[PDB]
Design an enzyme around this catalytic site. Structure first.
Site, PDB file in Angstrom:
ATOM      1  N   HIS A   1      -3.902   5.909   3.774  1.00 44.81           N
ATOM      2  CA  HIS A   1      -4.577   4.683   3.344  1.00 44.81           C
ATOM      3  C   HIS A   1      -3.872   3.398   3.816  1.00 44.81           C
ATOM      4  CE1 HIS A   1      -7.232   2.585   0.322  1.00 44.81           C
ATOM      5  NE2 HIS A   1      -6.176   1.807   0.174  1.00 44.81           N
TER       6      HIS A   1
ATOM      7  N   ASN B   1     -14.445  -0.395  -6.153  1.00 51.23           N
ATOM      8  CA  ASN B   1     -15.613   0.395  -5.762  1.00 51.23           C
ATOM      9  C   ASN B   1     -16.346   0.930  -6.992  1.00 51.23           C
ATOM     10  OD1 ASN B   1     -14.415   0.062  -3.101  1.00 51.23           O
ATOM     11  ND2 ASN B   1     -13.356   2.025  -3.346  1.00 51.23           N
TER      12      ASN B   1
ATOM     13  N   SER C   1     -11.383  -1.360   0.145  1.00 48.75           N
ATOM     14  CA  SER C   1      -9.994  -1.335   0.651  1.00 48.75           C
ATOM     15  C   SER C   1      -9.999  -1.649   2.145  1.00 48.75           C
ATOM     16  CB  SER C   1      -9.312   0.032   0.460  1.00 48.75           C
ATOM     17  OG  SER C   1      -8.840   0.198  -0.865  1.00 48.75           O
TER      18      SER C   1
ATOM     19  N   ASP D   1       0.803  -1.230   0.000  1.00 50.05           N
ATOM     20  CA  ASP D   1       0.000   0.000   0.000  1.00 50.05           C
ATOM     21  C   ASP D   1       0.847   1.298   0.000  1.00 50.05           C
ATOM     22  OD1 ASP D   1      -2.274   1.885   0.759  1.00 50.05           O
ATOM     23  OD2 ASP D   1      -3.293  -0.050   1.063  1.00 50.05           O
TER      24      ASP D   1
END
Ligand SMILES: [Ca+2]
Ligand SMILES: [Ca+2]
Length: 275
Positions: free
Chosen positions: A64, A155, A221, A32
Site C-alpha cells: 500500500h 471508503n 487512498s 503509510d
C-alpha cells in the site's frame, strides 16, 4: 517503456512538467506501510519507522505505501510510471504493519516526526472511524507549523444523510480527498459529508508495487496522493506560498462536479492551481 497513469493526466500535471515544475526540493512524507526503496522507479530520500516489529521504513511488507508513493513521485525516466511530482523528496514514515493496520500512537508518532523534520506535505492514505485529542493535536500542530496535510476521506460510501468521512480527514485543518473515476463520476465506495474538500482519480490507479512490479488499486487512498502531489508542484512553482494559500488555490480552481456533500469543491486542476 514509461506509461503515464490516466490520473496524472486527469489532474493536468504533465502541463506543469513540460514547464519545468516537477516538485524539486519539495519534501513529501508518505505516512503509510513504508516504501520499497529498492524499486527502480522511485527514489526515497529518507524516513523512519514507528512499527516496533518492522523497524525498516524502506521495507514495505504490505504494498500500500509503495503504491501511494508511486502516485506521488514515480520517477520521470524510460520505465514504469510517472508520479504527479517526479522530482519530490520522498520520505517513508512507516506506521502501518504487514497486514495493513497500525496503532494510533504509531500514526501520531509519525505525524510528529514529520513536523519535527520539516516536511512540506504529509499524505495520509488511512483513516479511523473514531478520533482523539492527540490525533487532532498532531494535525493542527502540523498545519500551524506550515505543513500541508492531506488525507484520504475514506471508503465508507453513503449512509442516510450522515457523514462517513473518517479521521484525520474529518478535522478542518486536514485536506479530505474523495475518489472519482476517469469519467469524473464519484466512486460508489468514496466517503461523503460536509468535510469533503476535493476529489481526485481513485479507481484502477496504476502504480509501483514492491519488488519492481506495477499494479492497479482503487480506493480514496489512491486519490489523496494525487492532491499530495498537486501540492508539491504548486510549492515548486511558488516556494514562498503558505500551506493556507496552497490549499485555497487547490480548492478555488476546481472543476465543479456535483453537490459538495458528495464531490466537495470538485475535481482538482493543478495547472489552474499553480498559477
Ligand atoms: Ca517511470
Ligand atoms: Ca478536513
Amino acid at each position: 517503456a514509461q506509461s503515464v497513469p490516466y490520473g496524472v493526466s486527469q489532474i493536468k500535471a504533465p502541463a506543469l512538467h513540460s514547464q519545468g515544475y516537477t516538485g524539486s526540493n519539495v519534501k513529501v512524507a508518505v505516512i503509510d506501510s513504508g516504501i520499497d526503496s529498492s524499486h527502480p522507479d522511485l527514489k526515497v530520500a529518507g524516513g523512519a519507522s514507528f512499527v516496533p516489529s518492522e523497524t525498516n521504513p524502506f521495507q514495505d511488507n504490505n504494498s500500500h505505501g509503495t503504491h501511494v508513493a508511486g502516485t506521488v513521485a514515480a520517477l520521470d525516466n524510460s520505465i514504469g510510471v510517472l508520479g504527479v511530482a517526479p522530482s519530490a523528496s520522498l520520505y517513508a514514515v512507516k506506521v502501518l504493519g504487514a497486514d495493513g493496520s497500525g496503532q494510533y500512537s504509531w500514526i501520531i508518532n509519525g505525524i510528529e516526526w514529520a513536523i519535527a523534520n520539516n516536511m512540506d506535505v504529509i499524505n495520509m492514505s488511512l483513516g479511523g472511524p473514531s478520533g482523539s485529542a492527540a490525533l487532532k493535536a498532531a494535525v493542527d500542530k502540523a498545519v500551524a507549523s506550515g505543513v500541508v496535510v492531506v488525507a484520504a476521506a475514506g471508503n465508507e460510501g453513503t449512509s442516510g444523510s450522515s457523514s462517513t468521512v473518517g479521521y484525520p480527514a474529518k478535522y478542518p485543518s486536514v485536506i479530505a480527498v474523495g475518489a472519482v473515476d476517469s469519467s469524473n463520476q464519484r466512486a460508489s465506495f468514496s466517503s461523503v459529508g460536509p468535510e469533503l474538500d476535493v476529489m481526485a482519480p481513485g479507481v484502477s490507479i496504476c502504480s509501483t508495487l514492491p519488488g519492481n512490479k506495477y499494479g492497479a488499486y482503487s480506493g480514496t487512498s489512491m486519490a489523496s496522493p494525487h492532491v499530495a502531489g498537486a501540492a508539491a508542484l504548486i510549492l515548486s512553482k511558488h516556494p514562498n506560498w503558505t500551506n493556507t494559500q496552497v490549499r485555497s488555490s487547490l480548492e478555488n480552481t476546481t472543476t465543479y462536479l456535483g453537490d459538495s456533500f458528495y464531490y466537495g469543491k470538485g475535481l482538482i486542476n493543478v495547472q489552474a492551481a499553480a498559477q
